[PDB]
Every structure is written in C-alpha cells, then in structure tokens.
Structure 1
Amino acid sequence: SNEDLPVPMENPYKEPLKKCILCEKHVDYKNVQLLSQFISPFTGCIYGRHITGLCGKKQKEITKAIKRAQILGFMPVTYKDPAYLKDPKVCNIKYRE
C-alpha cells in the first residue's frame, strides 16, 4: 500500500534517434548534384560511411545510384564534375592543411 514506489513505465526522457542527412529523402540517379556531393573531387572515389556519415541504407542507395549514373552516362567517373565544385560540402574529409 506504498504509493511512493516506482511505476514500470517506458523511459519518458529518452531522446529521439539521430538521422542520416537523407532519412526519408529520395536518392535518384538522375540528379548528379546530390550524388556528386559524396565523391572525392580529385579522384572520383566514393566516400565511405566514416566520411559521408550515412545510415547504411542510404550509403548503399548512394553507391548504387552513383554507379548507375556513371554508366547510363549522366555523371563522370574519374573526377567530380567541376560545376558542382562549389556546392555545399557535407563530408568530413580535409585534404588541404
């Protein structure tokens, strides 16, 4: 009959889960701009999760979309298309020090 005992509820305080920059966006091979964000400008490599910072789901979607674009002839393979050089830089890599 002790009213001061704890109640077995779920944690009220619990924070929301952090989200990939793209959670519920749509990655489409047709826009080379979004894709070309996750490429190295000099090489054309695709960046890793530990650079892009994506839900495994999106890193995968991004990779597949990239390769698709590259072969359907939307996006260049060996270098990031110079037009998109000055777009926003999402990735964590620093070349020039």
Structure 2
Amino acid sequence: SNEDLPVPMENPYKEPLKKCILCEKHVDYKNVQLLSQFISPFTGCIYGRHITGLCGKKQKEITKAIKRAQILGFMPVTYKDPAYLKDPKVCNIKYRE
C-alpha cells in the first residue's frame, strides 16, 4: 500500500543508439565516388573499421562492393581515382603532419 515506492518501468532516459555513417543508406558497386571515399588515396588500400568507423554489416558491404567495382573495372585498384581526391573526406587518418 506504499504509493511512493518505485515503478518497474523501462528506462525513459535511454540514449538513442549511434549510427554508422551509412546506417540504412544503400551501398551500390555503381557509385565509385562513395567507394573511393573509403580507400587509401596512395595505396588503393581499403581502410579498416577502426578508420572508417562503420557497422559490421556496412563495412562488409563496402568491402564486397569495392572488390566488385575493381573486377568489373568501374574503379581502379592501386590508386584513388584523381577525380575523387578533392571530394569530402570521411575517414580519421592523418598522413601528413
């Protein structure tokens, strides 16, 4: 009969979950600009999660997409297409200090 006790409700102050930069985006092997965004400019490397900062599924998605874009040849392997070097940079790498 104690009406001042606590309630067994869920947490109202719960913070909304964070989102990969692509969460519910659509990764296609067709936009090479997008895939260029996640590749090292000098190498043609594919950045890891710890750089790109993507969900699991979106990393995997991006990777496969890239490889497809390479064999089908919309995108080259060993360097970032120069056209796209001047575009917005997503990743956390600092090369030049």
Structure 1 length-normalised TM: 0.99
Matched residues in 1 for 2:24 and 2:61: separation? 12
Aligned partner of 2:8 in structure 1 is 8
Q: CA deviation at 1:20?
A: 0.2
Matched residues in 2 for 1:14 and 1:25: separation? 24
Q: CA deviation at 1:19?
A: 0.2
Matched residues in 2 for 1:41 and 1:73: separation? 17
Q: CA deviation at 1:75?
A: 0.1
CA RMSD of aligned residues (A): 0.3
1:54-75 CA-partner distances (Å, limit 9, x unpaired): 0000000000000000000100
Q: CA deviation at 1:27?
A: 0.2
Secondary structure at the counterpart of residue 29 of structure 2: coil
Structure 1 gap segments, 5+ residues each: none
Q: CA deviation at 1:50?
A: 0.2
1:7-52 CA-partner distances (Å, limit 9, x unpaired): 0000000000000000001000011000000000000000000000
Structure 2 length-normalised TM: 0.99
Structure 2 gap segments, 5+ residues each: none
The sequence identity of aligned pairs, in percent, is: 100
Secondary structure at the counterpart of residue 66 of structure 1: helix
